[PDB]
């Protein structure tokens, strides 16, 4: 390829601070905006290798039929491999009433319906991601429609299986004009465990124009290294060690690294940066130390440097507040959410400069010089 041989491992890696977005595994420095495409491809391979498992490509069979009852469409999808194995699933779409825009409705793919308010001119697709890969506990490993296609021992984590499903949904929408969706204006959202999922979807599926993870916490927009710092200093956060025993959001291989995080040549600031140069705003809640609040702020601050280096800082937002229940939406943040939806899904001239925290981090502080070691280059 134009990126040469993509690295999927870095055996000698050992860095207690955040991995540098702007240096390839081979030591080459990023210099151009085009370099970011290759670096993102390498980050994708590293994340798959160390924590996410293998993301399969589009299978040889993908078919879709559509029917509509009232304002509810049903998109019946079939996916199949060359060995004849197939699975089927049928997300529903809730439409705004009346005549759609020329190019169809903008759409947000909402994991299990999401927990954000979706404005009136945007359609909502409800993605039953738990059916694609189960997520009750460690007991759920290898269970779900995805594994009925690829096998229950396939390395994909549940979140990687969910991403695969989103990619098939977008495949189906592109081949189904009667769904009346503008496939150039698709967003994705989810809250809590499904916010972890939504971030993975936006990172790995480049056809998503806007990514909105809501209270995703550890394994979402928090960084593993920063959460280890938090837990060592007395905040009762979720961390890498606990999360792999709690559920199946990560590959089994990640168990080999959760006690050796400095040897992992990525962290979730690079996961989030895989969305660049597309748009993302994530929302966090400081009321629950489980979500690892300092870790999310520092992690997204580090991710933000990639957008800054690409000259598109305002395509990446972060808003972190307290004072509300988990996955309840505070009206105080509706303007920030709507700014990103209006700009990136509704083609309005909305400004999207949102990068705010209350710094309510408990027993630690954020010290950027202790975690971010790189200067930000102006990619050309
Ligand atoms: C370093 O790796 C990147 C990513 O594969 C590649 O684009 C670049 O050309 C490599 N450097 C050299 C000197 O081959």
Curated annotation (Swiss-Prot):
Post-translational modification: N-glycosylated.
Positions annotated as glycosylated: 26
Main location class: secreted
GO cellular component, one term: extracellular region
Broadest EC class assigned to this enzyme: hydrolase
Disulfide-linked positions: 191-327, 223-299
Span of the annotated motif GXSYXG catalytic site motif: 190-195
Cellular location(s): Secreted
Role description: Glucuronoyl esterase which may play a significant role in biomass degradation, as it is considered to disconnect hemicellulose from lignin through the hydrolysis of the ester bond between 4-O-methyl-D-glucuronic acid residues of glucuronoxylans and aromatic alcohols of lignin.
Similarity section: Belongs to the carbohydrate esterase 15 (CE15) family.
Protein name per UniProt: 4-O-methyl-glucuronoyl methylesterase
Portion of the full sequence shown: 95 to 474 of 474
